[PDB]
Structures are given as structure tokens and as C-alpha cells.
Design a protein around this ligand. Structure first.
Ligand SMILES: Nc1ncnc2c1ncn2[C@@H]1O[C@H](COP(=O)(O)OP(=O)(O)O)[C@@H](O)[C@H]1O
Ligand SMILES: Nc1ncnc2c1ncn2[C@@H]1O[C@H](COP(=O)(O)OP(=O)(O)O)[C@@H](O)[C@H]1O
Ligand SMILES: Cc1cn([C@H]2C[C@H](O)[C@@H](COP(=O)(O)O)O2)c(=O)[nH]c1=O
Ligand SMILES: Cc1cn([C@H]2C[C@H](O)[C@@H](COP(=O)(O)O)O2)c(=O)[nH]c1=O
Ligand SMILES: [Mg+2]
Ligand SMILES: [Mg+2]
Ligand SMILES: [Mg+2]
Lengths: 210, 210
């Protein structure tokens, strides 16, 4: 059976990830692909609830612990991800391990190396779209929410960490100009996704960062 | 202020860790030290409950996720551990990161390296007592419990992983002949502990595996 592709959308807050992930799944399904939507954090699980409470500031969680919970929250979906891909379903994922490293990396004394380790071995995305736009342009998209990390200084530090990660050529990173209109960004992402879905059927799923 | 020592007790199931940890705290306090008892997993926290449910077989947890939860369960106590040690309190800990690596390492496809990473940077123990005894002798101490890992094949594989870890000379590992009587084992551990408490006041707390 021809496997589905694992496509991840990354970027800072308000980059358009959730909008574009939803629209990409809709468009791929309308074009005859079997595509499904996933997101991280997956706030529905027991770990997910801990993470949601933390992000809402309803609880405080030690920084290393929360970093590990974010990773554990990905691992608990790995059996499902592998099964779906093997069944031929393409998975469009709103955030993945890259957000995990970039957001914890925005905290002092968290090396990129330590942050990556827990996620070493996850299913490696076939395509990582980075929805690029200036933080000042993202800032024009209404106001910051009230969750943790939703402030200018944290986003700036997370973006710099994403830039560091984009130096890993082991991954198929594709820059997307996320400053355009919702429909224009969508078309760019959809074309990239269709190419990746066709090529993913030619090579086995690999392991991230290993 | 003269810091307390961080003393960890490790070993296979039924090696006497919990008995000896309790008795060591009692004896140190009776000798005028400020010593407190800790254990991992710390089953009282939100993460701890997840871990307890898993160990009781009330739930299944993906292996990488549970490994990370075990580590997160240590990290969430790090601020407390650091504060207590700095206040001069010696902490006697029933299991730590070594058990975390040895038990997950008993599962195929879990490298020692990947298992160590989440715990890299925890407070480094001043003394790691390994309560050594043949698994066949441990087996004579009543019957195996009903929790996960409480069977001969898993314990054998975990012991082999502990042997691998004991090759790290970066740690002050001390072998204890845990086959002796409760009181004899206790005296050996108590003498080792008193020496370590005196020397811990001379050097700062370090970071594990880094
Ligand atoms: N291309 C775009 N131009 C303008 N506003 C946009 C664009 N894409 C999304 N938005 C709006 O910006 C906000 C953030 O979009 P969202 O998709 O939720 O981003 P993210 O998940 O990256 O935070 C929402 O109000 C959304 O409607
Ligand atoms: N030295 C010893 N000799 C014989 N039985 C022992 C000894 N130490 C502990 N035990 C008994 O063995 C069992 C396991 O001891 P415990 O301290 O709970 O070990 P652990 O925490 O390593 O599983 C308990 O019934 C305990 O009373
Ligand atoms: C997936 C993931 C998200 N995050 C953050 C990024 C966002 O600030 C936050 C909520 O995500 P969201 O913006 O997609 O709703 O979680 C981490 O800190 N680590 C992670 O592993
Ligand atoms: C601390 C720790 C324990 N364990 C295991 C060892 C025991 O089988 C189990 C319950 O511990 P206990 O024997 O000390 O009650 O948890 C792990 O698998 N990982 C860990 O990080
Ligand atoms: Mg979003
Ligand atoms: Mg015990
Ligand atoms: Mg390494």
C-alpha cells in the first residue's frame, strides 16, 4: 500500500498555521486524497489537559517537565500516525517537534540539543512548511491571546530558535510567504503538499533527528 | 550554608531499596543530621498518578511517552530538591534516573543514550548506592507483585542495563551487598552515607550526565 505523507505546518503565533492546516486538509480531500488533520499540542489526552492548563496559566509547570510533556504528547500519537500513514492517509499537522524545541528554546539555559532529544525518533515529516512572516505583520492580526508565550519577547526568541532549526538540511523545509492572503498562502501550500504526497509514496517513513 | 548530600538508592525489584531508604533517613536523623526521604516515581502528582495507573496496568501508555513522564516526574521535584539541599537537608532518594534508564532500556529498541537524555541536567547524586544481589535471591523475598515489570525476564533485562550504567565513572557509585540482613545492609549504607554527607559540603551540586 502506498503510504500517505506526513506534512507539518510550523511558524510563530498568528502565522496562519491553523487556518492553513484546515484549508489544506479540505482541499486535499476535495481533490480525492485521503487526508486528515492533527495538531500539537493534542489537548484532549490526559497529558494534553496538563499542557492546556499550563498554557492557559491555570497551572505552573516546571520548564523541563513541560518540555517533556509536550514531547510525550507527540509520542502518544505515534502509533496512530504510523498506522494512518501506512494505510495511505496523508496527515496535515498543525505544529510538531519544531515548535517544541523553538518554544522551550526561547527560555534561557535550554540548549537546542537538550530540547531536541525527547523527540528524537518521532516519525520524520515528509514536508515541513514554515509559514514565514515578520512578527510585526503577525502582530497586526488582532491582539495577542492570553496564553503563555503570547507576547512579543517570547515570540521573537522562539522565531530565532526556529531560524536555528532551519539549518537542519536533513529535513524537507519549505518557506511559505505567510504575509499574503489566506487564499494565496493556501494555494502555495497546496501545490507544495501535492508534490510531497506524490514523492512520499516512493520512500519509507524515516525517524526525526536520528 | 553547608549543603546536604543527594543520596540515591538503586537496584532491582526487592533489592531492599524502600526498606533501606526509610531506615537510612531514620538513622541519619537520630544522629543529628537533617535528612528527608524522597522516592521516584513520586506518585502523588498529576504525572505521578498517570505513572501509577500505568504501573498498576489500569492504563496502557506508549513506551516513549511513559519514559518521558518518568523523567518529567523527577524534573517537577527539582526546585524542591535544590532548595532542600541548599538549606542543608540531606535527601535520601528511593530510585532516580538510573531506574528510569534501566527499566525503559529493558524494552527493545530503546538505546541507553536516548533513555538518558531527558534526565540530562538533573541534580547529580553525591552517592549512588546500588543494592546488589542475585535476582534469584531477590526472588526468595516472597512473590512478585502485580505491577508492570514485576516478572523475571523484565528484571533480568533491567539489571543488565544497570550494569551498563555502572560503567559511568562520572558518578560516585557504591556497591552494597544487599543479600545480607536488613540491619547489616543498613549499617553498610549508613556508614557510606555519613562519609558522603561530610564530603558533599565541600563541592557544589553538579548536573547529571552533562
Ligand atoms: N493570511 C492571513 N492574513 C490575515 N489574517 C490571517 C491570515 N491567516 C490567518 N489570519 C488570521 O490571523 C489569525 C491567526 O490565524 P491562525 O490560522 O489561527 O494562526 P496560528 O494558528 O498560526 O496562530 C486569525 O484571526 C486568522 O483569521
Ligand atoms: N535484607 C533483606 N533480607 C530479606 N528480606 C528483605 C531484606 N530487605 C528487604 N526485605 C524484604 O523484601 C521485600 C522487598 O523489600 P523492599 O525494601 O520493599 O525492596 P524494594 O523497594 O527494592 O522493592 C520486603 O518484604 C522486605 O521486607
Ligand atoms: C507543539 C508545541 C507547542 N508549544 C506551544 C506553542 C504555542 O505557544 C502553544 C499553543 O499552540 P497553538 O498556538 O498551536 O494553539 O504551545 C510548545 O511550547 N511546545 C510544543 O511541543
Ligand atoms: C523511577 C522509575 C521507576 N521505574 C519503575 C521501576 C519499578 O518497576 C516501578 C515502581 O517503582 P518501585 O519499585 O520503586 O515501587 O517504576 C521506571 O520504569 N522508570 C523510572 O524513572
Ligand atoms: Mg493555531
Ligand atoms: Mg520499593
Ligand atoms: Mg547526544
Amino acid at each position: 500500500a502506498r503510504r500517505g505523507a506526513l506534512i507539518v505546518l510550523e511558524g510563530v503565533d498568528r502565522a496562519g498555521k491553523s487556518t492553513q492546516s484546515r484549508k489544506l486538509v479540505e482541499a486535499l480531500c476535495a481533490a480525492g486524497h485521503r487526508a486528515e488533520l492533527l495538531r500539537f499540542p493534542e489537548r484532549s489526552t490526559e497529558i494534553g489537559k496538563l499542557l492546556s492548563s499550563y498554557l492557559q496559566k491555570k497551572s505552573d509547570v516546571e520548564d523541563h517537565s513541560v518540555h517533556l510533556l509536550f514531547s510525550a504528547n507527540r509520542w502518544e500519537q505515534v502509533p496512530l500516525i504510523k498506522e494512518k500513514l501506512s494505510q495511505g492517509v496523508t496527515l496535515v499537522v498543525d505544529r510538531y517537534a519544531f515548535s517544541g524545541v523553538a518554544y522551550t528554546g526561547a527560555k534561557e539555559n535550554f540548549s537546542l540539543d537538550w530540547c531536541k532529544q525527547p523527540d528524537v525518533g518521532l516519525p520524520k515529516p515528509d514536508l515541513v512548511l514554515f509559514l514565514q512572516l515578520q512578527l510585526a505583520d503577525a502582530a497586526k492580526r488582532g491582539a495577542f491571546g492570553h496564553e503563555r508565550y503570547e507576547n512579543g519577547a517570547f515570540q521573537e526568541r522562539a522565531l530565532r530558535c526556529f531560524h536555528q532549526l532551519m539549518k537542519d538540511t536533513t529535513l524537507n523545509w519549505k518557506m511559505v510567504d505567510a504575509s499574503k492572503s489566506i487564499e494565496a498562502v493556501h494555494e502555495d501550500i497546496r501545490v507544495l503538499s501535492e508534490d510531497a504526497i506524490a514523492t512520499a509514496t516512493e520512500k519509507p517513513l524515516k525517524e526525526l533527528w536520528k
